[PDB]
């Protein structure tokens, strides 16, 4: 009976006295945690060992029994430093003991503190556990209460105030609860023996350790290794977790502004795109315009005006990979697609369902297609709606839904389908032996102007900050050029759907300078670059 | 089944989802999958040897490789060595084959010295020693390139690209160069040599260039072999 | 699965007779082809794996396409049978 | 004011408001709360009441749903349907809107209880805002079970009020009627409306 | 705390055909292919507590 008091006294004196140099680090941490309504304490094992090794020995022998005592000691200290009501505090641990590989845990480790690491592969939803709980006695209508703690309980049968064999029920109207969550840990990929599928474990956490990690992240874990009921005399193992380890600044935008006022920025950005590829100036310019894009607009009568850009390319393999790397968001695919959804979408079967291809998935970003001619039959017709409307709509087999397809498409191949694109060009080649020799020398080196990341961040900044408008002079220029070309064709087609593309190219060109208005300088370069032919 | 092939050899004797799995397998060296919220990864890390029947009953030599297969271009691009084997007509070859076949058939009949004579006539190396040798070489030997002759390799690569473009052939690529260097390392490993040598590069160049030539149409084949004589036969 | 033996298992070290082979579905012709290639049968499903021996010789009957043989054409043209299966009969 | 993702154990027994999409609806069922009986000999009408955990905010001993057949004084009883009282009951499920789902993660949802007037005012696919008391239920495995009590308690929202969300209809005010009638007497209303 | 003796080269062999009721509680030597394998679990050793591995 007295041992429960001495241990609590010992941990209470541990928190109140541990200085390293001049700061009571744990008194300060426990005060600073309460002010932000965080009821927990993060103790370090090495400091506990340094203070008194006997306390660590007791903790190491019987963790399941001794952890609650230290927690209630934390509560007793927490009340003194902040009151002249609080819940029970959560203890959290850090350690540097030798990691056990997940594959080696066995019957020798049951009810021991264990440190391991792996990859999280799944996460459950949150669930409720009880800590303080009230009880009603059915016969006499007497009432009492119980305090649960979550370490390895059932309702009692010692009736009070005969009173009967099993008279107790719960008043949920006057009880307290906490959160709980389940996780799955899979062993590290570079530790598995050859020819075997990786092994995994299941584990639990509660209160502040919940909702701290997501699937696919590599983590390190400290926790008690134990068993639970779910052959003969055989039980399942698991782990109780006690600890886990896993927009612009001003100085950034100053650099981007300095770039914006450079008189030769357009040349600089074109030169920075696929520098190994020789020639093909207008291709690089068109890719800059594709990356930057126009400006979206919405009108009083509800009509909606597109912002995206679309380009086709008729060597060519490299540029799509570069566009994938430089773009803020990017998807890469070949014409047949990743599944039966193809590029756009399809219905599959047993009840029917629907899944989207690599036009729905790239919504909000860029998508590049490696061979546009290998497009499937359904996608040939569906890309019309995917490009013009930026939507995909299906009414089949009782399904009736519409999907968003807001993206800019880059494509390459080697007909009427060319009408959907804003610009079309044909790739050109040159055959200097020095170029091939340089490439070969670089290949042997691995076998034996603006950088990508800076350019990507700059593109993000320009997309976020500016959305320019046409000046009146540009309007007069464009309308005169439009009627001029149509008259020239008449005496010898251009249509409104291409004028509205020239406008988007003009806005994208004005976007680089961060000029709020587009000007005749941009209109001239726009119509100059319009010569797809 | 690629998990079971980890650091081993994968064998395919005949041939959409299977091909899709093989596309991902050749593109990567690791396999990844997700299901009902779960996410996980696996390793393939293996050599793939495959065989196929050329689009029905018989191969057509007048046409390029793509006409004779049910494969996408990246498959042919990413494999190191490609080859076609055909039942050619020759009286002497037929006689040699028939004599060897009946001789082996008699040699296998159910009805120590006999075994030793049989074994030593069968092969020049005892295959137990060869298997141990292969295991030893795979575990111990890790060759490296020598930097002198690589200037010549770059010049040969540029020349091959120029000649390919000149006749209008599909061009040679960095994949072919990488395959040449890797095959040269394999030749060095086969004799337990930690150094690649000029003859290794020559043999690798011959293998890859001949494989590249076999994929082409007949007129392109004739032009290539007439120009490439200083590689396929000479060096 | 029910595992219970099929016809080819009962004909182990025996003669298996197939009548009107040409009416068999391709999806089952391939199964007979796979068994005939190896003289072996494999099962792997529902956590149960098994391998079995099928040293059986096959005797087959078939109809020419259109019901009457065409002397103008090869046997491949007359018969609705895929080439790998046709390659594995000793005698026609 | 919350959403299904963020509803947390701290909020139990509080009055909360949630927003989401209806995904499932149960069939409507009747529920007994009171029964009336006529004693054959004495001519006296008797009655009794019933309770269940979802019927009351406060907690009471559950009732066995048995009809009494015999009086305290031994008289045989008869049940008077039509004088007894039954009420309607329906359960639904509400899920967080897909626009708020993070990182392609699994979405989360809550079950709601409706009764009396609130029944059948929603269908699947409706965007809806629900007001009610957030409460727990059951023994949670502390009544003896094989789980070692790792499983948690069950929880619900008891529907107090339901409002739709517009994501079509409008209701006119008097000024709209005046303007609509006045505009109709222009000479060329058809041209104005068509060109608009 | 405890050591196990492993016996080797037992001089008689059965397949899974020849086993009969007379073999019960006798030592046997058997060969075959492993078709299926469970995961490893702990098992209570004595019926203070001790465990052992099981499969
Ligand atoms: Zn009592």
From Swiss-Prot, chain A:
Signal peptide: none annotated. Keywords: ATP-binding, Cell cycle, DNA replication, DNA-binding, Helicase, Hydrolase, Nucleotide-binding, Nucleus. GO terms for molecular function: ATP binding; ATP hydrolysis activity; chromatin binding; DNA replication origin binding; helicase activity. Residues 265-444 form the MCM domain. Its EC number is 3.6.4.12. It is an enzyme of class 3 (hydrolase). InterPro entries: MCM, MCM5, MCM5_C, MCM_CS, MCM_dom, MCM_lid, MCM_N, MCM_OB. The keyword Nucleus applies. PROSITE patterns: MCM_1, MCM_2. Disulfide bonds: none annotated. A motif (Arginine finger) lies at residues 419-422. One of its GO terms (biological process) is double-strand break repair via break-induced replication. It catalyses: ATP + H2O = ADP + phosphate + H(+). Component of the MCM2-7 complex. The complex forms a toroidal hexameric ring with the proposed subunit order MCM2-MCM6-MCM4-MCM7-MCM3-MCM5; loaded onto DNA, forms a head-head double hexamer. Interacts with CSM1. Present with 10300 molecules/cell in log phase SD medium. Early fractionation of eukaryotic MCM proteins yielded a variety of dimeric, trimeric and tetrameric complexes with unclear biological significance. The MCM2-7 hexamer is the proposed physiological active complex. Belongs to the MCM family. PANTHER family: DNA REPLICATION LICENSING FACTOR MCM FAMILY MEMBER, DNA REPLICATION LICENSING FACTOR MCM5. This is Minichromosome maintenance protein 5. It comes from Saccharomyces cerevisiae (strain ATCC 204508 / S288c).
UniProtKB/Swiss-Prot annotation, chain B:
A motif (Arginine finger) lies at residues 77-80. It comes from the Eukaryota. It is found in: Nucleus. Component of the MCM2-7 complex. The complex forms a toroidal hexameric ring with the proposed subunit order MCM2-MCM6-MCM4-MCM7-MCM3-MCM5; loaded onto DNA, forms a head-head double hexamer. Acts as a component of the MCM2-7 complex (MCM complex) which is the putative replicative helicase essential for 'once per cell cycle' DNA replication initiation and elongation in eukaryotic cells. The active ATPase sites in the MCM2-7 ring are formed through the interaction surfaces of two neighboring subunits such that a critical structure of a conserved arginine finger motif is provided in trans relative to the ATP-binding site of the Walker A box of the adjacent subunit. Present with 1690 molecules/cell in log phase SD medium. Early fractionation of eukaryotic MCM proteins yielded a variety of dimeric, trimeric and tetrameric complexes with unclear biological significance. Specifically a MCM467 subcomplex is shown to have in vitro helicase activity which is inhibited by the MCM2 subunit. The MCM2-7 hexamer is the proposed physiological active complex. Belongs to the MCM family. This is DNA replication licensing factor MCM2. The lineage of its organism: Eukaryota, Fungi, Dikarya, Ascomycota, Saccharomycotina. The chain holds residues 595 to 868 of 868 of the full protein.
UniProtKB/Swiss-Prot annotation, chain C:
Disulfide bonds: none annotated. A motif (Arginine finger) lies at residues 87-90. It is found in: Nucleus. Acts as a component of the MCM2-7 complex (MCM complex) which is the putative replicative helicase essential for 'once per cell cycle' DNA replication initiation and elongation in eukaryotic cells. The active ATPase sites in the MCM2-7 ring are formed through the interaction surfaces of two neighboring subunits such that a critical structure of a conserved arginine finger motif is provided in trans relative to the ATP-binding site of the Walker A box of the adjacent subunit. The six ATPase active sites, however, are likely to contribute differentially to the complex helicase activity. Component of the MCM2-7 complex. The complex forms a toroidal hexameric ring with the proposed subunit order MCM2-MCM6-MCM4-MCM7-MCM3-MCM5; loaded onto DNA, forms a head-head double hexamer. Interacts with MCM10. Belongs to the MCM family. Present with 13400 molecules/cell in log phase SD medium. This is DNA replication licensing factor MCM6. The lineage of its organism: Eukaryota, Fungi, Dikarya, Ascomycota, Saccharomycotina.
Swiss-Prot record, chain D:
It comes from the Eukaryota. It is found in: Nucleus. Transmembrane segments: none annotated. Present with 35100 molecules/cell in log phase SD medium. Early fractionation of eukaryotic MCM proteins yielded a variety of dimeric, trimeric and tetrameric complexes with unclear biological significance. The MCM2-7 hexamer is the proposed physiological active complex. Acts as a component of the MCM2-7 complex (MCM complex) which is the putative replicative helicase essential for 'once per cell cycle' DNA replication initiation and elongation in eukaryotic cells. The active ATPase sites in the MCM2-7 ring are formed through the interaction surfaces of two neighboring subunits such that a critical structure of a conserved arginine finger motif is provided in trans relative to the ATP-binding site of the Walker A box of the adjacent subunit. The six ATPase active sites, however, are likely to contribute differentially to the complex helicase activity. Component of the MCM2-7 complex. The complex forms a toroidal hexameric ring with the proposed subunit order MCM2-MCM6-MCM4-MCM7-MCM3-MCM5; loaded onto DNA, forms a head-head double hexamer. Interacts with CSM1. Belongs to the MCM family. This is DNA replication licensing factor MCM3. It comes from Saccharomyces cerevisiae (strain ATCC 204508 / S288c). The chain holds residues 165 to 366 of 971 of the full protein.
């Amino acid at each position: 009976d007295d041992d429960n008091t001495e241990i609590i006294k010992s941990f209470k004196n541990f928190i109140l006295e541990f200085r390293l140099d001049s700061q009571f680090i744990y008194r300060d941490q426990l005060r600073n945690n309460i002010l932000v309504k965080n009821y927990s304490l993060t103790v370090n094992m090495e400091h506990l060992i340094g203070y008194n090794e006997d306390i660590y020995k007791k903790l190491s022998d019987e963790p399941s029994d001794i952890i609650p005592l230290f927690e209630t000691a934390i509560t007793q200290v927490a009340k003194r430093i902040s009151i002249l009501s609080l819940p029970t505090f959560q203890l959290i641990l850090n350690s540097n003991a030798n990691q056990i590989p997940l594959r080696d845990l066995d019957s020798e480790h049951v009810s021991k503190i264990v440190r391991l690491s792996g990859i999280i592969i799944s996460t459950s939803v949150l669930s409720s556990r009880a800590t303080y709980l009230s009880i009603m006695c059915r016969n006499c209508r007497h009432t009492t209460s119980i305090t649960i703690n979550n370490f390895n309980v059932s309702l009692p049968r010692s009736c009070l105030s005969n009173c009967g064999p099993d008279p107790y029920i719960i008043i949920h109207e006057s009880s307290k609860f906490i959160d709980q969550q389940f996780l799955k840990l899979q062993e590290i990929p570079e530790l598995v023996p050859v020819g075997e599928m990786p092994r995994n474990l299941t584990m639990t956490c509660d209160r502040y350790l919940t909702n701290k990690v997501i699937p696919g992240t590599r983590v390190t874990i400290v926790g008690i290794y134990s068993i639970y009921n779910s052959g003969v005399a055989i039980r399942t193992p698991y782990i109780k977790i006690l600890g886990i380890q896993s927009m612009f600044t001003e100085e950034e935008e100053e650099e981007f502004l300095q770039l914006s006022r450079n008189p030769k920025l357009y040349e600089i950005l074109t030169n920075s795109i696929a520098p190994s590829i020789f020639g093909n100036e207008d291709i690089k310019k068109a890719i800059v315009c594709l990356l930057m894009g126009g400006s979206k607009k919405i009108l009083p009568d509800g009509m909606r005006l597109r912002g995206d850009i679309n380009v086709l390319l008729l060597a060519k393999s490299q540029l799509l990979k570069f566009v994938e790397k430089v773009s803020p968001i990017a998807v890469y695919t070949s014409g047949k697609g990743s599944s039966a959804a193809g590029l756009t979408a399809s219905v599959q079967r047993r009840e029917f369902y629907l899944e989207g291809g690599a036009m729905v998935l790239a919504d909000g970003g860029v998508v590049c297609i490696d061979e546009f001619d290998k497009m499937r039959d359904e996608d040939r017709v569906a890309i019309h709606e995917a490009m013009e409307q930026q939507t995909i709509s299906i009414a089949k087999a009782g399904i009736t839904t519409v999907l968003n397809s807001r993206t800019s498409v880059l494509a390459a191949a080697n007909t009427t389908i060319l009408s959907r694109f804003d610009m079309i060009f044909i790739v050109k080649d040159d055959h200097n032996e020095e170029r091939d020799i340089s490439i070969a020398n670089h290949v042997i080196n691995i076998h034996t102007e603006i950088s990508i990341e800076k350019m990507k961040r700059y593109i993000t900044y320009c997309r976020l900050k500016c959305a320019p408008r046409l000046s009146p002079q540009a309007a007069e220029k464009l309308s005169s050029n439009f009627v001029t070309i149509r008259k020239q064709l008449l005496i010898n087609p251009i249509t409104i759907r291409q004028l509205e593309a020239i406008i988007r190219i003009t806005e994208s060109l004005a976007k680089l300078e961060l000029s709020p208005i587009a000007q005749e300088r941009h209109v001239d370069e726009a119509i100059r670059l319009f010569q797809a032919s | 089944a690629l998990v079971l092939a980890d650091k081993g050899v994968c064998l395919i004797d005949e041939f959409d989802q299977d091909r899709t799995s093989i596309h991902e397998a050749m593109e990567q060296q690791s396999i990844s999958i997700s299901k009902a919220g779960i996410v996980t990864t696996l390793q393939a890390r293996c050599s793939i040897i495959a065989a196929a029947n050329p689009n029905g009953g018989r191969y057509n030599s007048t046409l390029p490789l793509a006409q004779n297969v049910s494969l996408t271009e990246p498959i042919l691009s990413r494999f190191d060595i490609l080859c076609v084997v055909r039942d050619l007509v020759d009286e002497e070859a037929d006689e040699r084959l028939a004599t060897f076949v009946v001789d082996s058939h008699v040699r296998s009949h159910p009805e120590l010295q006999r075994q030793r004579k049989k074994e030593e006539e069968i092969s020049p190396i005892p295959q137990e020693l060869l298997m141990k040798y292969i295991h030893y070489a795979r575990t111990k030997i890790y060759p490296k390139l020598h930097q002198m002759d690589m200037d010549k390799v770059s010049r040969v690569y540029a020349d091959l690209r120029r000649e390919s473009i000149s006749t209008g052939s599909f061009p040679i690529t960095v994949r072919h160069l990488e395959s040449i260097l890797r095959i040269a390392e394999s030749f060095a490993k086969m004799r337990l040599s930690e150094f690649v040598s000029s003859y290794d590069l020559d043999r690798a160049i011959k293998v890859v260039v001949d494989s590249f030539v076999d994929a082409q149409k007949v007129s392109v084949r004739r032009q290539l072999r007439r120009s490439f004589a200083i590689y396929t036969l000479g060096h | 699965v029910v595992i219970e033996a099929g016809a080819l298992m009962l004909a182990d070290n025996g003669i298996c007779c197939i009548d009107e082979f040409d009416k068999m579905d391709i999806s089952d012709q391939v199964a007979i082809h796979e068994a005939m290639e190896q003289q072996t049968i494999s099962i792997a499903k529902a956590g149960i794996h098994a391998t079995l021996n099928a040293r059986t010789s096959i005797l087959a009957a078939a109809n020419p396409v259109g019901g009457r043989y065409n002397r103008k054409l090869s046997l491949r043209g007359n018969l609705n049978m895929t080439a790998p299966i046709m390659s594995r009969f000793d005698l026609f | 004011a919350l959403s299904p993702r963020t509803l947390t154990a701290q909020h139990l027994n509080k009055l909360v408001s949630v927003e989401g999409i209806v995904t499932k609806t149960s069939l409507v069922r009747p529920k007994l709360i009171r029964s009336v009986h006529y004693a054959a000999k004495t001519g006296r009408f008797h009655y009794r009441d019933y309770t269940d955990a979802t019927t009351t905010l406060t907690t009471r001993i559950p009732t066995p749903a048995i009809y009494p057949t015999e009086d305290t004084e031994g008289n045989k009883l008869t049940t008077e349907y039509g004088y007894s009282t039954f009420i309607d009951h329906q359960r639904i499920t509400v899920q967080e809107m897909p626009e708020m789902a993070p990182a392609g993660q699994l979405p989360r949802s809550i079950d709601v209880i409706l009764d009396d007037d609130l029944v059948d005012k929603t269908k699947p696919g409706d965007r809806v805002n629900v007001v009610g008391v957030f409460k727990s239920l059951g023994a949670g495995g502390m009544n003896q079970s094989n789980s070692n009590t790792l499983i948690g308690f069950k929880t619900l929202i008891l529907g107090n009020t339901v409002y739709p969300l517009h994501a079509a209809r409008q209701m006119l005010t008097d000024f709209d009627i005046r303007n609509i009638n006045k505009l109709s007497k222009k000479k060329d209303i058809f041209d104005i409306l068509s060109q608009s | 705390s405890e050591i196990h003796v492993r016996i080797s080269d037992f001089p008689t062999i059965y397949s899974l055909r020849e086993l009969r009721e007379s073999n019960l509680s006798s030592l046997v030597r058997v060969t075959g292919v492993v078709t299926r394998r469970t995961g490893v679990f702990p098992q209570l050793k004595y019926v203070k507590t001790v465990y052992r591995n099981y499969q």
